[PDB]
Amino acid sequence: IWKFQRHDLIEEYHGRPAAPPPFILLSHLQLFIKRVVRHKQLKNKLEKNEEAALLSWEIYLKENYLQNRQFQQKQRPEQKIED
Amino acid sequence: IWKFQRHDLIEEYHGRPAAPPPFILLSHLQLFIKRVVRHKQLKNKLEKNEEAALLSWEIYLKENYLQNRQFQQKQRPEQKIED
C-alpha cells in the first residue's frame, strides 16, 4: 500500500510550480492572470520510426515470455502424474 | 467465539419492550397486570404451497452439492496415485 501511495505524491511535487510560500504569491497571480485570460515527464507521443522498433522489440519478448510460461507448466509434479 | 456470542445479545434487545428506564415502570406494571391476570422474526410457520416449493428448491441444490463434493474428491493427488 505504501509503495502504491508513493506515486501521487511524486506526481504532485513534480507538478507544482517552483515557488515556496514566500515567493508563492507572484506565482499565484501569474496563475490568476491566465485564469482571467502536462509535462513531457509522464506523457509523451513518440515517432513512428522509433515507436515501431519499440513495438517490434516488445512483440519479440512477449513471445519469449510465453514459452517460458508453458514450459514451467510442464514441471508441476501434479501435471506430471497426470501424464 | 465473538461471532458466536453476537447472537443472544441480538435476541435480547430485539425482544425487550421499547421502554427505557424512565418510562420502564409503566412497562413493568403493564407486565405485572398480566403476571397477575415470541415474535414473527425468529420463528414462523409457513404455507404448504410456499413451503413445498421451498423444500423442492433445497432438494435440488443438495443434489448439486453432492456432485461437486465427490468430484473434487477425484482430484486429491493421493487418490490419483491409488488409481
DSSP string spanning A17-49? -S--STTHHHHHHHHHHHHH---TTT-----HH
Q: How was this structure determined?
A: cryo-EM
Q: How many CB pairs under 8 A join A and B?
A: 5
CA A83 to chain centre: 42
Indicate the resolution in Å.
Answer: 3.8
Grid cell for residue B37: 391476570
Confirm if A81 and B81 have CB atoms less than 8 A apart.
Answer: yes
Is the CB of residue A37 less than 8 Å away from at least one CB of chain B? no
Q: Distance between CA atoms of A30 and A36, rounded to whole angstroms? A: 10
User: Which residues on chain A are in Cβ contact (under 8 Å) with B77?
Assistant: 78, 81
The CA distance from A61 to the nearest CA of chain B, in Å, is 35
**Subunit contact B77:A82, Cβ cutoff 8 A:** no
